[PDB]
Symmetry: C4
Subunit: 387 residues, 4 copies
């Protein structure tokens, strides 16, 4: 039975802790994969943490990070949300140095890009087998969300980028049913730049807040209709939500074009709330440390900088990193609306710490009807490790 | 299908061993969480050990206990009753430095309190997702049972405390259906003090024997009707059942008020038997060592000190600690009545042993139709460990 | 749906390897329980290895065997047949320093005896919970099969011994339905001695070949009708099948009384074949080394020493030990008859090897329509271990 | 419900990565079996990696390879495709130093040959139990595919060899239903030589490309009709596909007889494509290093050397080894045709590397509608290990 994700996103005063896996502390002695980009997606029955494995284990010579991001040993695997990315509970998903995964109601669909940078291959899995394939259309590191993809009425949608990391690239929407690609569209977005989209179903369409790694501190935003018509631009709110970024007071927002004169970036998320936005961001405007979620009044549709609520979840004394979006299925939450939820990756080791290795642990938050007090559910590992 | 827990508690001559997990001995070489407060609750199909993890593993630097009780790395997880709290069979439940869990017949409901002491948050999970939330109402370490909660006809009930550990605090009953709080009541109990309740269903109402950490050596007792009307007071029997406590002969019992002039305490349990009580208690009146269960004639309703049966389960040469209550569902035991069962936590390491770490193993006993001989199913680990 | 075990035992020319767990070799680096007495019983859907754990792990200080056989840390757990007794795939069964387990078609029933030698308690589990209890009736180490028990038409039967290890003791049959004891009978057997019975269903009754630890080199044999009437005596064949034992040529068989003037013994098995017997035995008549299965013509009902077939399975250069019986359910094998199967425990470490510890691995053989060549599927661990 | 494998093999432009287990890198610290011959077979619901375990673990004294290939500690076990052959997720299949496994739609059938070389025994398992047996018919190391077997309409077929490794031997087809052998035929093939067949269902018959270890660089090929009539010979294409082998230009192909004057060999695969062939082969013509798949036009039925497509999957700088065939069931892929898929074993350690041990990791590729770029998904372990 196909999941209907046609409802509106729940309006939410605050965010409550869902889980915390404790990957790295546990991996001081347990058998834990060295991972990065640990996103969450939910099936009608259970939510799971997916993650790229570097194919090695914490506290072992193979975690020696000289090993490439985009290596043949990089696999997409998963476990249940809140469990560490450990070998003995891991489920194999796909070979991928960049990934997206989402469940439609019957089965899991996953998309793992691997292979050489000039002609990468993306295998689409459905229910545990390859079902279809996308090739590099631009010969420059084919990539995708690193976050849950979005299934509405049996059809699953996702965004992909082919091209340079720091100048104009090419961006596409892709549409599958039961693991077969059944539609796709280029995204006309000049000067603009889109990477690592964080999407969620909302009102029968698909909203993503993604990353601009070229010019913009604000995040690109698109809304994909079921016929892969779309609208694209930037999260309107007059507050930079990327990293690095300039201070809030030196930033004029825009619904149209990038703002800020910085390159680089980091993956983030945002949730539409009527016309408001819940937008996540690192606390540091410089590095990937600390994490907070601001609610800007009218920020989805205005250059507003009127802030209703702010809730710290990782304090500025602790490393954070990637963040992404997903919803709770109605069939799990009880609600008549789609509960917004996010995860926050917390990076330990290189480049900011003196270890041979790099990995991350995560924490997942879900949208509730109440204000939740500020806190810091930071990673917690005692660095360095035995090496 | 909802579990009916409306039956009476089985009248039981004695207690038979259900399980013994051997957590700490096993964790000398295996991959075992460092845990505390390892209670048991049963679903129509299986009983499980829940436990707070300190997020680290035995024989590892992160077990270094300087780490706070109420830390962001403290998670509620579980395994099947009798299995050790090991990583590779663990199921994630919630982020919580204080927890309660119970199954209603369809799904598991869990409640994990985490966050800062001045405004703690309790996320209610249902079937593996956050469904509702309680906030600190008194700004002083929001807490709960550390024992199975109680589901009668689909609705699950539990007790919570907001306030000081050593003077008057505030106590509430809470009532959920399918993860949504649908009712709650304050508990008018002045001079009295309630913490870490050990509840069980009995006669269509909910009976808890809880801990008074302020004035009383005897245990508070409440009986919650389905409309959250209640009665509250103390276990009548003229025998102190807390720790520390005075000797039996210097103690006049009371159904109304605390007795003994000691502060402190430890979590314990008791089971109504018509008018008698099966009351558990440490053997030492000073420290948490050894464990025994006395049956006092008319002790539920009298100041009686008439003891019918006594059964040692952990001898005074061995560490014990927390204890709690739960029943076997009819759908599991075969019986027309609710089998009383308890667990006993057995604490090793700090503060009484010279290790860096502290954890505990457990043993579960269930009510039977026969006298069972005294014995000691103590923890057994050979301290200290490699460190 | 209840298993009918009313069929006849399959007539079988030979025995084929079912499994080999490799427990001890694997436990040189893996996380493997230190075990003894690893028997097998089958459910309509899967066969499992049960085993007493000493509660510790190979290559760890807690395996230090000074630890008692009959300790409070001794638990009955299980895994699927052929898998090692490892922590992360183990299922908890009961607290027991002596055990029997068997499946009736709906659920697993297990029986774990634990507690003090003067008044031991046997908890009967059904579907994962205590359901009933037997107490010491003779105050001298209550014990049982260490082998699969036998379920015919929903009712499960097993044999127990209360008394001395080396002179007359007391022996009982016990009969459960759904975990409730519903019948029992004393076994009038003077001068005779019964321990550690190896039973199997055959022709709607229950046949056990058990061990006499007092006087007899030949094995006691009983046949339990559904009304717990019985016949008891000795396996007729004129060949000693216990260990230690005298040579075949100095042994006159008997259907009635023990023969041989030795005390001691070891657990073994035998399978009726019309009037023949398949009888297992160590190769060494002195120690527990090597294993073979002889088919004696008319040996169930005669003092015969006419040997049709012999098949070595563990050679005299390798340690063996315990052996037991069980059948394959029709619902698994396809056959219209009950396939005889046995397991052979293979003991490493103390007393015969210079280690601190003692454990064993196993191998399971099933009855087939062909002669199978002699071989040795011995344990294989390289002793001693890191200690 | 029985799987229909009666469809034609999908015509496929290229091969996409299915999985990569990372066994050996992971086994630098994790608990990983030392394995060889890690093939894949699929059930209607999931594909699994089967493998011979040497019964020991990486980084342990028991991996010390002096241990025989054909030892009593050699077991067939399995895990889900893409997961490493680790102890805690392993499922026991059979005792076997040579194996084949395949699922018919209802259950798994496995065939494990073990025992002495002069009279080896092959136990057939069905749904987890021994159901039937084949004995050595030629007294010279009874062996089989090391690759998925083939189930068409409930009946499963497989090829076996009894005889010398380097001169004429004997070869048989075998046909089971529900674990009972129900048919078999000798394969009249003089001068020819057949070992380690790699089969797949195609057009309602069974096609195997196998290994000739006597005279031929080209691979034997057979096509087994459901009545075990057959045709046998050699893959026609004028290109040697074994290892070692001569260069392509010095090789005249044949549909009839072996070509090349070399002994030895290694297991490989091939897939019929109408009249073309997808044939796999090591890159090195000398050693087992690198892996590629050529599509020869008309190569199934001609001496053609017209090459349409070539796709490297493991580069000549990296060890490869065994390869085998299997299909995706329609009930998994969605397709109206049978998706060709193969796996490639990647051997580390002895004989080519300076370690005490030998094992291998694998990677699985499935047939798709597109050209996939060359790459190398090599094993990746950093040799030697701690030993
Ligand atoms: C496809 C890819 O490699 N994406 C990068 C991505 C970056 O290249 C741009 O978004 C594309 O222009 O950015 C980052 C990043 O910003 O940190 C990552 C995440 C790093 C994973 C990692 C870290 C340490 C060792 C191995 C892998 C990703 O691996
Ligand atoms: C919510 C809380 O922290 N409760 C305490 C509780 C105590 O604070 C009072 O009941 C509230 O007034 O008491 C105890 C206790 O009496 O020992 C505990 C249990 C200790 C868990 C622990 C032990 C060592 C290291 C880390 C955690 C609990 O952690
Ligand atoms: C109930 C019991 O303890 N049975 C013994 C049993 C023996 O006492 C007689 O049968 C009863 O009279 O015999 C044996 C035996 O003959 O070896 C055992 C098995 C030993 C298990 C063990 C070995 C080493 C360390 C810990 C336990 C059993 O543990
Ligand atoms: C049945 C058997 O032993 N087959 C061999 C097989 C070889 O004997 C011929 O095909 C039969 O004539 O060939 C090979 C091979 O060509 O390498 C193997 C695979 C080796 C497994 C292994 C490697 C190292 C240590 C232990 C086992 C197989 O083990
Ligand atoms: Ca940027
Ligand atoms: Ca007190
Ligand atoms: Ca004897
Ligand atoms: Ca050859």
């Amino acid at each position: 039975t196909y999941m209907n994700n046609t409802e509106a996103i729940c309006d939410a005063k605050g965010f409550a802790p869902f889980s915390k896996d404790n990957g790295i502390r546990i991996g001081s002695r347990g058998h834990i994969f060295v991972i990065r980009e640990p996103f969450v997606s939910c099936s009608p029955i259970e939510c799971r943490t997916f993650f790229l494995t570097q194919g090695s284990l914490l506290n072992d010579k193979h975690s020696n990070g000289t090993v490439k991001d985009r290596s043949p040993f990089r696999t997409l695997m998963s476990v249940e949300v809140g469990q560490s990315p450990n070998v003995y509970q891991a489920r194999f998903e796909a070979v991928a140095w960049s990934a997206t995964a989402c469940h439609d109601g019957k089965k899991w669909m996953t998309v793992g890009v691997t292979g050489p940078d000039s002609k990468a291959v993306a295998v689409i899995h459905y229910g545990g087998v390859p079902t279809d394939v996308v090739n590099s259309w631009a010969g420059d590191i084919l990539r995708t969300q690193e976050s849950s993809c979005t299934c509405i009425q049996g059809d699953c949608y996702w965004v992909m980028t082919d091209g340079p990391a720091n100048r104009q690239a090419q961006y596409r929407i892709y549409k599958a049913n039961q693991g077969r690609i059944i539609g796709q569209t280029d995204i006309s977005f000049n000067g603009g730049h889109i990477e690592e989209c964080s999407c969620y179903p909302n009102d029968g369409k698909v909203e993503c807040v993604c990353r601009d790694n070229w010019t913009g501190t604000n995040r690109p935003v698109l809304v994909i209709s079921p016929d892969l018509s779309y609208r694209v631009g930037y999260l309107c709110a007059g507050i930079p939500s990327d990293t690095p970024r300039g201070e809030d007071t030196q930033f004029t927002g825009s619904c149209t074009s990038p703002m800020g004169n910085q390159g680089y970036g980091v993956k983030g998320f945002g949730f539409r709330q009527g016309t408001d936005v819940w937008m996540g961001r690192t606390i540091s405007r410089t590095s990937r440390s600390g994490f907070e979620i601001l609610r800007i009044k009218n920020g989805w549709t205005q250059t507003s900088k009127e802030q209703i609520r702010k809730q710290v979840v990782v304090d500025n004394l602790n490393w954070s990193g990637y963040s992404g979006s997903f919803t709770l299925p109605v069939e799990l939450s009880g609600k008549d609306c789609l509960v917004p939820c996010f995860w926050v990756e917390m990076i330990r080791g290189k480049p900011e710490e003196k270890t041979i290795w790099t990995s991350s642990s995560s924490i997942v938050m879900c949208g509730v009807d109440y204000e939740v007090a500020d806190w810091s559910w930071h990673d917690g590992a005692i660095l360095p490790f035995d090496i």
